[PDB]
Amino acid sequence: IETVPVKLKPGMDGPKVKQWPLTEEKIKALVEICTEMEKEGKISKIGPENPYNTPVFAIKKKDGTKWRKLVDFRELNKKTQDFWEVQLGIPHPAGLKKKKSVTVLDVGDAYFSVPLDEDFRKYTAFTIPSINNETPGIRYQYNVLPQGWKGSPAIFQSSMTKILEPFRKQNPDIVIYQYMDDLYVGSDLEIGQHRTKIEELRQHLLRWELHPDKWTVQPIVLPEKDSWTVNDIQKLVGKLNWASQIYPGIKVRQLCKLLRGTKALTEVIPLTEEAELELAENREILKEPVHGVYYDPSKDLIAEIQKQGQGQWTYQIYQEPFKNLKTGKYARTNDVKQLTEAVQKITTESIVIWGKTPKFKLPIQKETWETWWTEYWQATWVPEWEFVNTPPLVKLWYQLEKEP
Amino acid sequence: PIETVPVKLKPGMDGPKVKQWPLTEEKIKALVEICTEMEKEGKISKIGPENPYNTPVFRKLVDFRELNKKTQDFWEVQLGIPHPAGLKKKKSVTVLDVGDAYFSVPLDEDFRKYTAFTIPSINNETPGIRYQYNVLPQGWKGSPAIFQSSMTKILEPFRKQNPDIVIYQYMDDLYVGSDLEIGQHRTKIEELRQHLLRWGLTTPDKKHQKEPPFLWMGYELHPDKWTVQPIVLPEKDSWTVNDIQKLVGKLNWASQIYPGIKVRQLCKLLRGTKALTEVIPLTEEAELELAENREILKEPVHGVYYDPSKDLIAEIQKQGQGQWTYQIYQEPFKNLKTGKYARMRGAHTNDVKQLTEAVQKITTESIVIWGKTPKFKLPIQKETWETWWTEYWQATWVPEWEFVNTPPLVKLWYQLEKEPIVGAETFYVDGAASRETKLGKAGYVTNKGRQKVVTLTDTTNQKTELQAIHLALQDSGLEVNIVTDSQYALGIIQAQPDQSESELVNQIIEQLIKKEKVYLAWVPAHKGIGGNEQVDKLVSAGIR
DNA sequence: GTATGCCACTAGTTATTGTGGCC
RNA sequence: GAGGCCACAAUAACUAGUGGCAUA
Ligand SMILES: O=C1Nc2ccc(Cl)cc2[C@@](C#CC2CC2)(C(F)(F)F)O1
Ligand SMILES: [Ca+2]
Ligand SMILES: [Ca+2]
């Protein structure tokens, strides 16, 4: 078996990411996993002359609490991006988002057979740390294509089409998409004979349930009141005035006109005819599909999340602020747990629709997220994330989305 | 045979070519004496014209900062060091200092030529004696990482046959610990010495081995306990900036085992630019703090090691003005370690929030030192915590803690209304400032026809919006509706601050506890919203 | 009038000084 | 050849993003 030469962009250095400290139960699990991977030739111990490093974690994965190892190849993936997108880019099927049911399968073990270019192995270095820095740190590097590196499916992609090409002739109205270590299978067939059709594929490759059209953007709905008070108008005006950055046709001019002079907040205010009309067009703008937003493939996707309270979270996927390609609500345990499942939901939905993962903006302190995110992580990829405040009007606006 | 480790220079760089300055005769006679012996033991070799490099002769024989800058990086070892509270109790402990550490590891052959150096001639009429290293040089960037790596391979077979014996490598030292009775421990120590000797590594014999306690990294390590080396914090009638820096260093060093240390008041005295000689007058609340610190440090303390079969308990206490201390223990009154947590300072933060960050810091430290998170005991009721975190935009998570009734508790001094108060007077507040003159005004107008404006000097837009809320509270009754366009001013009030550095916000918190019902609302500025418009015209008169 | 500062939240970076070590 | 190296801390500097405001 012959290796594809790989290379960093010619001004780049290798990953030198510091290892976040691990619990004893996960250091032990990693030591066990890595001696078995080394015993099978997949990784090799390295000396101190290798200066690179990439973080490593342990997650409970495959619905069973047998530990899995997750290497965080985010920095390496950025440093090899022209390799795995421009040169050997997997194409994304626009039809996949339209199948009535899509299941996801782990194709992770397939990389283990394929070797990895000699001159690239040093950049896959990682370090099992030790409690209280009491022992120096166990260093390895990959000899075979690593799960979690984006160049892995890029290299294995030519071999992957030959495993599935016989399947494609059989079921020509089934769509297969590969994103990193995952296979997304698209079918319009009934849910009962979907599982039989997705097993036979699973059985087929060993010899070597998403509903995307259920996803749908809900519209904003405004208060409906028999009586309006000064306070109700002021709250509504502040929201609609902010929301005009999203819907430029929204107007508050006839609502502000009702607030003449220095009124007590509880005073009742009869909506004049001009007010009733402005409110009624405002509603229709919000009930209509938002318009003027279109996906730009040269831009990063961004996912923002607001803690709504009582186990409820709102989220938006966009590229330019206020131009939402998608919005939605994730419902039900603790904040970190819920936030981890929201991030995973939004990322696979993002993989299905565009073939890319969004960069997340999370409403949590970094150090708390860095302590607990592997506690519930089940995915083989790790999105990019950063940590943000949530302005009050944002939370107040997306709290108005209609529920299923 | 210890195998060499391949070492390269940084991409694009050649080796050092620095000039050797002339030296005194009494210095050159000593150098040729040191160097001829190092040649006889094979650590260096005479070189000649074939070598174009040089590094000036100098602890260290040779000064390698140029070579070190051109040497490749290493993913380097002893990033952190153990903290003593993470070690386990032992019956017997030994420390072996490896004598000929670097002299016993051969340097990668093709790298040797870059370590060249010259002993110069006396009158410089002659050229000098030129040498290069065959072994790891003292002071070369790679020697620690390469020695450590070699020592780890040498210790693998011995570690494997002796699972019960813990060996920690630290620079040239081996710290060897066991639960064996002293005699059988000494049998193991000497087996370890023989193992090391096969590779040429020499260590002190039993007669020459130090006895506990061991001085290590400023700690004093016993088999069953640890302490810091004793702190001495001086007594001066005039304190200089450099002196105050020295005190905060000693105090922050002491705070890992001495509980309740506090530095926030001596830290304020180091703010601003000031020469290191400037005699700084101690503020008396700093003098008070320096006093209680001298009290803490007069008692003796020690920490205990970690029993991995008990839970760790962490307990936090509020110390006032954004300061917090904590204690980690597994058996009551037997601390593994203590520490402190201090807020940003300039900012005013809610006490539930400050407490949650203390927990966050302690949780991270605890995973580093023991590989598991503790059980917390916190001076906060489980429903005080619940009402605050369910009403806050940010997520957090403390897996397990419980209320412990040690005052000062943390509590929410006031509770704002969710709905406007019927029959209470509605105030519209506003402020205005000019940046050039730093002059401003703050005021309100009221649905019942009342209004006020006050003029402020040396102020900001942000201060005047708070002053305006200050006035509406000052001049209303126990129930009031207040309307502002400052999401800043409003956010300070909703995120109920602890007592802070600003007297304005402290007055406001005081005013708000005394109230009976308070509803606060935000409206956007410059929209023709009544009330807000009227008060804006008032307050902006002398200012725009 | 877009351009700024003002500070609350979020995230940092390079320098000095100090404590405790090391070379 | 004017000391570097590690952890922690303090200080200063450069801060940047989000938000509402405040003057032009
Ligand atoms: O785990 C333990 N327990 C322990 C107790 C007392 C002593 Cl004095 C020493 C130790 C030890 C160590 C060490 C380095 C911190 C110097 C030893 F390696 F065992 F020596 O580590
Ligand atoms: Ca204002
Ligand atoms: Ca105003």
Side-chain angles (χ1 to χ4, degrees), chain A residues 2-6 8 10-59 64-65 67-98 101-167 170-192 194-196 198-206 208-213 215-401 403-404, chain B residues 1-26 28 30-58 60-124 126-235 237-273 275-544:
Chain A
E2 191 188 34
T3 71
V4 178
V6 189
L8 309 184
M12 210 92 73
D13 205 22
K16 316 219 212 171
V17 191
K18 303 204 183 191
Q19 173 73 38
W20 191 270
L22 311 179
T23 61
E24 165 148 273
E25 152 187 303
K26 286 165 163 168
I27 282 171
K28 291 189 190 185
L30 291 176
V31 165
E32 205 253 4
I33 298 176
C34 280
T35 61
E36 193 51 73
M37 287 180 72
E38 152 168 62
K39 190 157 301 163
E40 304 166 9
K42 301 159 172 187
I43 56 179
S44 298
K45 302 224 192 176
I46 56 167
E49 71 279 28
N50 187 330
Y52 308 108
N53 188 66
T54 288
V56 66
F57 310 92
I59 63 197
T65 71
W67 290 113
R68 176 204 272 270
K69 142 166 123 148
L70 170 60
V71 182
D72 169 15
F73 278 120
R74 275 179 297 187
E75 274 312 288
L76 187 60
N77 287 341
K78 287 164 66 188
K79 291 172 174 283
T80 62
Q81 178 209 19
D82 49 357
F83 170 95
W84 57 258
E85 207 172 25
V86 176
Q87 171 180 327
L88 280 131
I90 326 281
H92 177 260
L96 163 60
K97 68 173 75 71
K98 328 219 187 70
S101 290
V102 175
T103 42
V104 189
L105 308 175
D106 203 326
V107 190
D109 285 4
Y111 302 117
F112 276 138
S113 35
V114 178
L116 178 69
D117 166 37
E118 267 312 287
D119 305 341
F120 199 66
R121 290 181 193 183
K122 45 178 167 171
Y123 305 120
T124 56
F126 60 99
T127 297
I128 312 193
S130 64
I131 297 119
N132 196 25
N133 288 295
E134 275 169 287
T135 43
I138 309 149
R139 305 252 301 148
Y140 300 95
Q141 79 189 8
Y142 272 87
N143 300 309
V144 309
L145 294 184
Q147 304 174 19
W149 180 50
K150 267 161 180 173
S152 275
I155 280 162
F156 193 81
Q157 183 204 3
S158 72
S159 317
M160 186 69 181
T161 61
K162 299 197 298 177
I163 295 135
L164 297 176
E165 190 276 342
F167 193 93
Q170 236 283 348
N171 316 69
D173 279 37
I174 295 311
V175 51
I176 42 177
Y177 178 51
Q178 190 189 2
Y179 187 81
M180 281 162 118
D181 311 339
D182 293 305
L183 227 49
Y184 298 87
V185 301
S187 139
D188 294 37
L189 323 184
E190 61 285 3
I191 79 109
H194 184 72
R195 329 285 193 81
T196 78
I198 73 110
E199 293 177 350
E200 205 74 295
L201 171 55
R202 180 200 305 191
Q203 231 167 3
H204 167 98
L205 48 83
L206 194 151
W208 271 260
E209 322 82 337
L210 296 166
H211 300 294
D213 290 57
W215 316 333
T216 183
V217 171
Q218 306 284 66
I220 291 285
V221 299
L222 304 176
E224 281 265 349
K225 302 201 144 71
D226 285 15
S227 318
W228 293 78
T229 63
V230 163
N231 186 73
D232 302 328
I233 309 297
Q234 284 169 344
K235 289 189 317 162
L236 185 53
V237 155
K239 298 197 217 312
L240 295 176
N241 169 61
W242 171 91
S244 64
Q245 289 164 128
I246 298 172
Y247 313 83
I250 294 184
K251 303 292 157 186
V252 299
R253 191 177 74 270
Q254 295 310 325
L255 281 143
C256 294
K257 276 195 59 176
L258 304 188
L259 309 176
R260 288 231 259 272
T262 302
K263 308 279 206 52
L265 291 195
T266 46
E267 174 173 317
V268 181
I269 298 267
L271 291 186
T272 59
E273 254 176 4
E274 287 297 81
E276 270 300 349
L277 207 89
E278 177 179 89
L279 196 50
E281 321 186 331
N282 278 342
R283 291 189 161 101
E284 207 38 68
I285 299 164
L286 304 163
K287 295 212 301 266
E288 274 163 12
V290 55
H291 31 242
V293 322
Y294 298 106
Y295 172 73
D296 178 336
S298 71
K299 282 185 182 163
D300 280 350
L301 293 169
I302 296 162
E304 195 155 40
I305 297 176
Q306 300 87 34
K307 180 171 131 172
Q308 236 19 287
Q310 205 179 352
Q312 304 296 305
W313 306 76
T314 52
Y315 74 90
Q316 305 84 52
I317 310 160
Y318 67 82
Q319 297 176 292
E320 304 275 31
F322 307 111
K323 309 246 194 307
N324 302 325
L325 308 172
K326 279 274 169 303
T327 81
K329 206 143 186 318
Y330 178 85
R332 280 174 169 158
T333 203
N334 67 83
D335 287 349
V336 164
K337 177 181 186 182
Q338 272 147 41
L339 191 54
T340 290
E341 326 188 312
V343 176
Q344 281 167 135
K345 158 196 175 44
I346 295 159
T347 302
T348 92
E349 147 184 345
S350 188
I351 286 165
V352 166
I353 296 178
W354 303 283
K356 299 201 311 207
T357 58
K359 151 67 168 22
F360 286 79
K361 281 163 144 51
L362 305 175
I364 192 162
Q365 245 163 61
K366 186 169 176 201
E367 187 162 332
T368 303
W369 182 256
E370 284 174 331
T371 293
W372 297 111
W373 75 268
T374 61
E375 195 77 343
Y376 307 91
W377 205 260
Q378 292 149 57
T380 163
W381 34 255
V382 185
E384 309 225 337
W385 44 48
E386 69 184 31
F387 307 92
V388 305
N389 84 38
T390 306
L393 291 172
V394 179
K395 178 197 152 329
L396 290 170
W397 182 253
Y398 294 105
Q399 168 184 10
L400 300 170
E401 282 197 56
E403 292 281 13
Chain B
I2 305 175
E3 179 150 326
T4 63
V5 162
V7 178
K8 67 157 201 59
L9 293 174
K10 263 146 165 164
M13 316 229 50
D14 202 6
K17 290 174 201 170
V18 187
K19 170 181 308 160
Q20 175 68 38
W21 300 349
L23 308 187
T24 69
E25 159 59 64
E26 34 252 59
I28 295 185
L31 285 178
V32 314
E33 288 183 4
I34 276 81
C35 283
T36 40
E37 174 56 12
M38 284 175 75
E39 182 180 14
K40 304 330 143 201
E41 316 175 42
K43 313 309 174 183
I44 63 182
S45 300
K46 269 168 190 198
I47 61 176
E50 71 280 356
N51 202 320
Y53 304 109
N54 208 66
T55 273
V57 108
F58 190 66
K60 304 166 190 174
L61 189 65
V62 189
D63 173 42
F64 281 118
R65 18 164 142 192
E66 259 347 280
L67 180 58
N68 291 333
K69 275 165 205 165
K70 307 157 163 322
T71 296
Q72 80 173 80
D73 287 346
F74 301 84
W75 190 250
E76 255 159 35
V77 82
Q78 312 214 213
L79 44 168
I81 51 136
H83 186 275
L87 308 172
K88 322 315 163 60
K89 189 159 49 55
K90 293 305 166 200
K91 198 183 287 254
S92 316
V93 291
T94 290
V95 54
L96 304 179
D97 52 286
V98 181
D100 43 1
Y102 290 180
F103 271 15
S104 311
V105 179
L107 178 55
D108 192 63
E109 174 67 40
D110 281 338
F111 200 89
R112 314 208 172 166
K113 66 195 172 219
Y114 306 124
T115 75
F117 66 93
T118 309
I119 309 169
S121 295
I122 11 80
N123 282 10
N124 280 138
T126 324
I129 327 174
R130 273 167 72 51
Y131 293 99
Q132 81 194 7
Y133 274 91
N134 304 310
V135 304
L136 299 180
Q138 291 292 331
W140 177 56
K141 173 189 180 178
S143 310
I146 294 168
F147 172 78
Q148 224 246 10
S149 190
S150 312
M151 179 66 63
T152 293
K153 289 167 205 141
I154 288 159
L155 295 183
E156 290 158 357
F158 187 91
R159 279 214 176 81
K160 177 179 167 28
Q161 317 161 38
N162 297 285
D164 52 312
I165 291 178
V166 346
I167 298 170
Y168 170 72
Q169 327 160 219
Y170 170 80
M171 317 260 77
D172 282 18
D173 292 343
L174 297 180
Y175 283 80
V176 191
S178 86
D179 282 325
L180 307 166
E181 290 304 340
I182 191 64
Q184 296 64 56
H185 176 83
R186 305 209 154 114
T187 282
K188 277 296 159 181
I189 294 313
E190 172 48 28
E191 290 196 85
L192 178 62
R193 298 215 314 122
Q194 299 171 312
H195 182 56
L196 300 170
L197 238 224
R198 297 204 70 72
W199 279 277
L201 303 164
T202 67
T203 49
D205 69 6
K206 173 182 164 166
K207 318 144 190 299
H208 289 88
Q209 282 163 27
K210 309 154 188 121
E211 231 180 73
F214 303 135
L215 297 186
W216 176 79
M217 296 295 299
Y219 298 103
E220 181 182 87
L221 306 185
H222 298 265
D224 60 306
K225 71 201 193 216
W226 67 273
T227 174
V228 288
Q229 300 189 2
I231 293 99
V232 184
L233 73 174
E235 198 149 290
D237 271 315
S238 97
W239 291 102
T240 216
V241 151
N242 198 237
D243 294 343
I244 293 200
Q245 297 165 321
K246 287 169 181 144
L247 305 180
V248 181
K250 287 171 174 318
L251 289 175
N252 169 77
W253 171 251
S255 82
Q256 50 181 322
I257 197 44
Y258 289 86
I261 293 290
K262 285 178 307 183
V263 283
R264 162 72 66 84
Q265 288 301 320
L266 293 95
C267 277
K268 284 182 186 166
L269 274 56
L270 294 164
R271 310 228 209 195
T273 46
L276 279 64
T277 329
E278 177 161 53
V279 271
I280 159 84
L282 293 211
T283 74
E284 261 66 334
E285 59 183 352
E287 269 283 11
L288 175 148
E289 195 187 71
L290 176 58
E292 331 166 66
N293 285 335
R294 294 177 188 283
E295 289 326 287
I296 299 168
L297 304 170
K298 205 195 153 287
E299 93 214 307
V301 284
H302 68 273
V304 299
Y305 298 129
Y306 162 71
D307 176 355
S309 74
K310 312 286 183 42
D311 281 333
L312 293 128
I313 295 103
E315 177 164 352
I316 311 182
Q317 290 89 222
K318 180 168 170 171
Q319 275 179 321
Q321 330 177 311
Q323 300 171 96
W324 309 72
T325 34
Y326 65 94
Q327 297 87 35
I328 321 282
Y329 54 84
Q330 304 176 285
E331 300 308 327
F333 308 98
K334 284 166 207 159
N335 284 341
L336 295 113
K337 74 179 305 292
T338 72
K340 54 180 184 51
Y341 170 82
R343 133 228 280 175
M344 292 50 82
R345 309 109 187 290
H348 23 258
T349 311
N350 173 254
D351 261 349
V352 180
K353 181 83 181 296
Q354 298 190 33
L355 173 69
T356 304
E357 283 154 25
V359 164
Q360 183 206 65
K361 170 194 184 302
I362 295 156
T363 300
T364 289
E365 159 164 279
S366 159
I367 286 160
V368 175
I369 294 169
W370 306 287
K372 75 187 200 237
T373 61
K375 268 79 179 155
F376 285 88
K377 308 226 318 300
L378 313 165
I380 185 176
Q381 329 237 27
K382 273 261 178 96
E383 68 90 45
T384 285
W385 174 278
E386 221 52 65
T387 73
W388 197 80
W389 276 106
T390 62
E391 282 177 356
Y392 197 55
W393 57 271
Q394 202 173 40
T396 194
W397 187 34
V398 182
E400 34 197 16
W401 65 280
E402 68 157 353
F403 177 45
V404 65
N405 209 333
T406 95
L409 299 197
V410 306
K411 36 145 191 160
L412 299 160
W413 329 103
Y414 54 81
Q415 189 182 7
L416 297 181
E417 300 273 315
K418 311 284 196 291
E419 296 305 316
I421 305 150
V422 189
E425 181 176 4
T426 301
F427 286 65
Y428 294 83
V429 290
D430 192 21
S434 113
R435 178 215 318 306
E436 306 70 26
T437 89
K438 268 187 152 282
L439 206 80
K441 300 196 177 206
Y444 58 79
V445 306
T446 265
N447 70 318
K448 305 175 174 185
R450 279 201 290 162
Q451 64 175 57
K452 191 151 86 173
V453 74
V454 293
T455 301
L456 307 156
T457 175
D458 191 28
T459 202
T460 64
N461 76 289
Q462 300 280 76
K463 270 148 175 163
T464 69
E465 304 281 348
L466 284 159
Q467 289 278 36
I469 311 189
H470 186 22
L471 291 210
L473 287 168
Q474 184 170 98
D475 298 10
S476 71
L478 308 178
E479 307 190 332
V480 59
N481 302 277
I482 310 189
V483 171
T484 184
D485 50 352
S486 182
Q487 285 193 10
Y488 162 64
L490 188 57
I492 282 182
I493 285 157
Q494 297 157 345
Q496 327 193 24
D498 195 10
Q499 310 252 335
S500 51
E501 294 204 76
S502 172
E503 177 57 12
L504 178 45
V505 319
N506 279 325
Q507 299 185 250
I508 290 184
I509 300 161
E510 216 84 32
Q511 299 180 280
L512 287 151
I513 301 156
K514 301 192 183 175
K515 293 297 179 187
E516 203 169 71
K517 281 183 179 192
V518 171
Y519 175 87
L520 278 118
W522 173 82
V523 289
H526 317 296
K527 255 56 206 165
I529 290 183
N532 169 253
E533 199 167 5
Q534 282 76 19
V535 63
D536 169 47
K537 168 154 163 66
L538 211 73
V539 153
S540 66
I543 303 284
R544 298 207 286 266

